[PDB]
Amino acid sequence: LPEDRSQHLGEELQGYWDQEVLRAEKDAREPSLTKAIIKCYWKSYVVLGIFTLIEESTRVVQPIILGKIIGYFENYDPSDSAALYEAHGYAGVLSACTLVLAILHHLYFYHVQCAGMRLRVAMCHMIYRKALRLSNSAMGKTTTGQIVNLLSNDVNKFDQVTIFLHFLWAGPLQAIVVTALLWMEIGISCLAGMAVLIILLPLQSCIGKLFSSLRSKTAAFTDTRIRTMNEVITGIRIIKMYAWEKSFADLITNLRRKEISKILRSSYLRGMNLASFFVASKIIVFVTFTTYVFLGNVITASRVFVAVSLYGAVRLTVTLFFPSAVEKVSEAFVSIRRIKNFLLLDEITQLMIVNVQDFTAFWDKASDTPTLQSLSFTVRPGELLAVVGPVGAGKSSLLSAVLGELPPNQGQVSVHGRIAYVSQQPWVFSGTVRSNILFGKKYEKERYEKVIKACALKKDLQLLEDGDLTMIGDRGTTLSGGQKARVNLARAVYQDADIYLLDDPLSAVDAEVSRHLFELCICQALHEKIRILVTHQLQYLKAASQILILKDGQMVQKGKVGFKAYKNYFTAGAHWFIIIFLILVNLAAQVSYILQDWWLSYWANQQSALTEKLDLNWYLGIYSGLTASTVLFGIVRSLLVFFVLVSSSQTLHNQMFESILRAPVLFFDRNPIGRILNRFSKDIGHMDDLLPLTYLDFIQTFLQVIGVVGVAVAVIPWIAIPLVPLGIVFFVLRRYFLETSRDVKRLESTTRSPVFSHLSSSLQGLWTIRAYKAEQRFQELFDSHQDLHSEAWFLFLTTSRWFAVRLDAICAVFVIVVAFGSLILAKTLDAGQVGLALSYALTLMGMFQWCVRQSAEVENMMISVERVIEYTDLEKEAPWEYQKRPLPSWPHEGVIIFDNVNFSYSLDGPLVLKHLTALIKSKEKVGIVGRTGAGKSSLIAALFRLSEPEGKIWIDKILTTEIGLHDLRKKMSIIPQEPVLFTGTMRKNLDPFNEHSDEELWNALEEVQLKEAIEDLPGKMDTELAESGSNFSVGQRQLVCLARAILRKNRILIIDEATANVDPRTDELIQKKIREKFAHCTVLTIAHRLNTIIDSDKIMVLDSGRLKEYDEPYVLLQNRDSLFYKMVQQLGKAEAAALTETAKQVYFKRNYP
């Protein structure tokens, strides 16, 4: 509707906010955003408020009319037909109150949602209006996430507050008036009940604080686990080859052991909160009626069950809703104050030729130096200015100065004509790549195609699946970097400005593309235009009309889940006996809950059947027992669900983690790191932190719904006939709703993230989108994405309302059946029985909707459990240890034999080694040579049995097939292709099994000459390394990987580019260290820098299929028909000459030796 779409709805609130800034400027006070919101929406809040007034009035009137119905039975006489008519009157009024609440909820459930959405959508408008106009200072001291958190979090508070806000008055007023009504019904004993009620307020508030401390304290372990698990999952191939699986197992078990201790202790406090909500009514009624009878009053059914029904009214609003409102209105005011701050944040000022004179600027006046100083320049049509200089020269400060984003500190800047800007970091928005080029301009195909061909972009637009109609993600994720760079320039070239600002786009592309862009676009296409080009591509500079060189900031030069999933989730947590015990204690909790209320009905009947008086010792004694058993079972049941379900979450994580460790590497190839880690971060998260609560809350309420129906059918058995249709309706109604709702619920979620992602993209682009003065267009696109989500959300609202307005209709019917049916059968039953029937009947709505709501949340969250259960059942590597284990001296020589070996990364996959058959002699030096991925990397995966080979691999006449994987993998030393360090001690990275001497460690750390860094690091070998050891250089990480091999003594060493991350001199020196440290080893080297292997005793040359050469490299080089000679000949003449000279000399010496 036009009255609810974002532009109209937001523009009015902004009008009030500015007027609250015009006021408090015509006045010395500061502004209030709360005044602006209130002054805008008070007309809606009032009607939201009147519903609460009328609703809470009827909820209090229901108990009083219930008293009139029961009063029919307390003095029943079948001869008074008029009394029967009058009871039907109140039975009518009690029905009307019931359907009134249904309609009030049906209206209120609409207007609260619409009022909340309107306030949210108006706030979204003002926040995004600012984001297009933030100062570039503010965009420094604030971040993309911190602004998006406004939309993604702080604004979502407002439509929660609009629900609860009026309970901040309705709660207190109801507690007062219900206290007054209880006083008229009971007398002073009503205070003893309310004393408990106002104590559960602080007591539940305290448990919330104590829980929040444990919930805060446990998050440190969770992040430590998840970060450890992330490096475990990321590094898995290196973790596997080192056999360090037992090390990271013992880390994760200790992290998980400590974490679940906190999750259990926090969960028990949270079980105590829900136990309080369950027992609260029973304690409140117990202390009330105990004190009432001790004052000598006698229990009669009307007074009791009116009073019990009144506590049922005030309890829920005072204990649940009033604290929820005070909490969420606190969240409101922190959000309002945060949004007030952001809306007041610094803005961009309200700012053919370019002319700049005496120009100086500071990004921060607190800087020790200017960020630009004493610049001056001017440039005019047909001129190209090239801007040149080192890193930190100020080049990007100049262009952002000319664009006017960096204001001048001194001097002056002026421009005439349109300015184009292309940013070095390319930027793209959710839309067609064509839209990413047209940027809202009219589409003209010829200038467009000229742009495409001038940008040499036609191929990429022909390769995209839907062509240039391919939707690009809000960060360009479906383009390559070089496409989005060229797309980002193509935009500016279509916009055809008078002045171009180019911030080094020519570095985002190859020299050929760069010269194609520079020559064709910049020189030829922009030939008539002003250009200012910053670039590191100095190669063209003589083409520039003028050159400005900068340094240090100044100028230098100019020139649904199945039952089995539920069964496994419960059975995995505890023995079969405890789950039976869990069911019994759940039923025992609810049966005892009912039975004390039945006991008042029995006590009422007995008092009515009677001077003489009841023996209080019996009735009050049993009443104390039944109340106490509800407390005991209510507590025990709460703690035991949490124990069984958190214990299940402990067991299932451990089975899943052992499975993930034992998964074959192929599992981490076919599933990405994020999707695996999401099992541990989200799904185990729910299984720890939400699903146990939701199960307990569902179970607690569901048994209580069965309690209402059970009491009613136990007291009036003929109600079972009206209920079987009512059940049949409900089952069909739920089935129909869940079939249709799941789609609209998804649609309402999938349409929200475009709002945040459009903002998040719009923030990254702010420089360029404001450059074209595209603000107001990019505001309408937000209003389109916002008001399109509003449309999706409105369809969800009507769908949910259609269910709710009849889910509470079947509940309203149930009250009619009990209310009127009780009178139709009035001859059969006594007043206390009818009081028990109806006081339970009156509580059905509210909790019945909540029971069904919690059913949907359980059934949804169980998807997380099914998603972990699939990972308990992964395929496994062969056992770490077989029955046979090699003698500890093996390998004694390190002879490796390949025999007819084939390998494939999957048993369903193509072969990537075939018939590989070769002998490697002990102490022999072998180089592995061939095309990228042509067998080379598969050989390492085969030798370590990362995927099982076909054919036979022997080590010292042991078949590697017939021994445990840790026998094989431990007894071979590997220096990986990409080095990895793990977050922990330097010692844990050198010797996690703690089996090398500290003298040996230091000797290795000396032998790699890393000790200087370990002496520079404060903790020596015990120093805590950074994230992945980022404190060390990638070269130093290779030094650590060399040390590990030095420590791990083995006959067999495998090497893969192990030194390529090092400068050529230190690279070749640590190559010499390898020769010095492993001269005795059998060494297999995989490399591309043939200079690293030319001195091998043999080189294996692999086709992608087969071992084509395997011989002395000199003999291979003398075999000019070898691929080895062809390869060195392809490298070049001097390369082959150098290599062949080295080979000849070493071959002669090794033959002479």
In CATH, what number is assigned to the domain containing residue 440? 3.40.50.300
To which residue do tokens 């992040």 refer?
A: 223
Domain-embedded: residue 311: no
Alpha-helical (H) ranges within 890-985 are 936-943, 965-970
Domain-embedded: residue 1084: yes
State the maximum Cα–Cα separation within the chain, in Å, rounded to a whole number.
132
Token readout for 127 is 């926040």
Q: Name the nearest CA neighbour of 340 among 656, 679, 709, 24.
A: 24
* AA identity, residue 258: K
The residue out of 552, 582, 614 marking a domain boundary is 552
3-class DSSP assignment, residue 244: coil
Token readout for 229 is 């698990």
Domain-embedded: residue 773: no
3-class DSSP assignment, residue 106: helix
The residue out of 552, 578, 599 marking a domain boundary is 552
* AA identity, residue 1134: A
Token readout for 815 is 């009250």
Which neighbouring-strand residues pair with 1098?
A: 926
Burial of 1086 (0-12, 13-18, 19+ CB in 10 A): buried
**Experimental technique of record:** cryo-EM
Cα separation, 546 vs 559, in Å, equals: 6
CA distances from 70 to 43, 88, 91, 838 (A): 42, 12, 10, 9
Q: Name the nearest CA neighbour of 901 among 944, 933, 958, 943.
A: 943
How many other C-beta atoms are found inside a 10 Å radius of the C-beta of residue 197?
A: 22
Resolution stated for this PDB structure, in Å: 3.3
Domain-embedded: residue 201: no
Domain-embedded: residue 448: yes
**How much of the chain is helix, strand and coil, in % rounded to 5?**
65, 10, 25
Domain count, the chain: 2
How many other C-beta atoms are found inside a 10 Å radius of the C-beta of residue 26?
A: 8
Which neighbouring-strand residues pair with 384?
A: 531
Q: Name the nearest CA neighbour of 171 among 275, 38, 45, 59.
A: 59
Alpha-helical (H) ranges within 431-575 are 435-438, 445-454, 458-463, 481-495, 511-516, 563-571
Domain-embedded: residue 1128: yes
Which neighbouring-strand residues pair with 551?
A: 554
| CA angle 271–277–281, rounded 5-degree value | 145
Cα separation, 214 vs 217, in Å, equals: 5
Domain-embedded: residue 496: yes
Token readout for 374 is 């004493």
The residue out of 552, 576, 592 marking a domain boundary is 552
Cα separation, 411 vs 798, in Å, equals: 61
Cα separation, 221 vs 264, in Å, equals: 14
3-class DSSP assignment, residue 950: strand
Cα separation, 844 vs 839, in Å, equals: 9
Domain-embedded: residue 1020: yes
Domain region containing 384: 372-552
